[PDB]
Amino acid sequence: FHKIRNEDLIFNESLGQGTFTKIFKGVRREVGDYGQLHETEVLLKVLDKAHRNYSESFFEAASMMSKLSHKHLVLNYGVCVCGDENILVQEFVKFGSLDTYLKKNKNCINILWKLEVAKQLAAAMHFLEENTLIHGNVCAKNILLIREEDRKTGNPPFIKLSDPGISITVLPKDILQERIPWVPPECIENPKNLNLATDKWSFGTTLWEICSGGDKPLSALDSQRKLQFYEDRHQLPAPKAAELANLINNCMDYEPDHRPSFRAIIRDLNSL
Ligand X SMILES: Nc1nc(Nc2ccc(S(N)(=O)=O)cc2)nn1C(=O)c1c(F)cccc1F
Report in angstroms the alpha-carbon separations of 51 from 46, 107, 141, 176.
Answer: 11, 40, 22, 17
Region from 27-35, 93-101, 167-175, 177-185 binding ligand X, contact rule CB under 6 A: 93-101
Nearer to ligand X, 70 or 260 (CB): 70
Separation of first and last alpha carbons in the chain: 41
Is the Cβ–Cβ distance between 159 and 144 less than 8 Å? yes
d(CA 27, CA 43): 8
Nearer to ligand X, 128 or 247 (CB): 128
| Residue from the set 10, 15, 27, 221 that interacts with ligand X by CB under 6 A | 15
Provide CB contacts within 8 A for 73, sequence distance 6+: 65, 124, 127, 160, 161
Nearer to ligand X, 98 or 251 (CB): 98
- 144 contributes a contact to ligand X by CB under 6 A: yes
- 210 contributes a contact to ligand X by CB under 6 A: no
What secondary structure letter does DSSP report for 13? E
Nearer to ligand X, 43 or 251 (CB): 43
Beta bridge partners of 119: none
List the x/- string, 24-63, binding to ligand X by CB under 6 A.
-------------------x--------------------
| Residue from the set 66, 120, 137, 162 that interacts with ligand X by CB under 6 A | 162
Beta bridge partners of 22: 17, 46
- 102 contributes a contact to ligand X by CB under 6 A: no
d(CA 101, CA 45): 20
List the x/- string, 64-83, binding to ligand X by CB under 6 A.
----------x---------
Closest CA to 205 of 136, 138, 272, 121: 138
Nearer to ligand X, 8 or 163 (CB): 163
| Residue from the set 85, 96, 178, 196 that interacts with ligand X by CB under 6 A | 96
d(CA 73, CA 124): 7
Closest CA to 4 of 19, 26, 22, 23: 26
Nearer to ligand X, 137 or 198 (CB): 137
| Residue from the set 90, 137, 198, 212 that interacts with ligand X by CB under 6 A | 90
Is the Cβ–Cβ distance between 251 and 260 less than 8 Å? yes
d(CA 266, CA 81): 40
Tell me the closest approach of the beta carbon of residue 262 to ligand X, in angstroms.
Answer: 21
Region from 84-92, 190-198, 231-239, 240-248 binding ligand X, contact rule CB under 6 A: 84-92
Interface with ligand X (CB under 6 A) = 15-16, 23, 43, 74, 90-93, 96-97, 100, 141-142, 144, 162
